Nucleic acid binder design. Structure first.
Lengths: 109, 107
DNA sequence: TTGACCCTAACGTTGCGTGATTGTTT
DNA sequence: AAAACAATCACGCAACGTTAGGGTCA
């Protein structure tokens, strides 16, 4: 029924420290707590975690992920594209950086 | 032939705040200090600042840049390559992420 | 009692931006 | 006697990693 850090960390691949941090940030708040304070996660919490984890792969930030999960109305298409555009530019920057390196490695190679 | 922050900053493009930081980090230390504490950079300090800015463009971090300027024995060739390689892998990760977005935009 | 497991601090990391407050004078 | 310019704090940002010390018991 419920899961505690060790298990959630194992099922999802993230660290316990991560679960805490996501808890402190209000990104992912456990569904329950034991009298002793132990965090107890529900299957729903696990879906939520998978989604925040997926948006993480696309390069979004915890705040963006948060605002998108807490506010579903927020159009996702435009976000997925803009994020793409942002990514593409980051890629373009690195290219210019690599050129600068090559354009520099031409001297006693 | 000495310059104070306003100038050096204006001549190099970086901010005065940057110059201070680079000073605290021991990356770029002013050639001279004024009695009142104003720092004065020499033409040499300016060359050093340019070198710094180059490596900064290639993507190196202050520590790496520092360690390279303070020890000119460090083979620069391999450094420029390894850095190139690192930049490439980053490019690749960027690609996979873009693919994943596209692979999701099918709707 | 004892592992195995959980918690809360709180500093470390990268590179300055942005005030706030205050001294100096190229 | 003011306008510019310089200085030293020190908090803020992204996302956890990593001890350090100390309860709990699925």
């Amino acid at each position: 029924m419920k899961y505690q850090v060790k298990q959630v960390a194992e099922i999802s691949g993230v660290s316990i420290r991560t679960l805490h941090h996501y808890d402190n940030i209000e990104l992912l708040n456990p569904s329950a707590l034991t009298d002793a304070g132990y965090r107890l996660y529900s299957d729903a919490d696990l879906e939520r975690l998978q989604q925040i984890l997926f948006f993480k792969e696309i390069g979004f930030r915890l705040d963006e992920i948060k605002e998108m999960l807490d506010h579903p109305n927020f159009d996702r298409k435009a976000a997925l594209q803009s994020q793409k555009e942002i990514l593409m530019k980051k890629k373009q920057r690195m290219d210019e950086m690599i050129q600068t390196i090559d354009r520099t490695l031409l001297s006693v190679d």
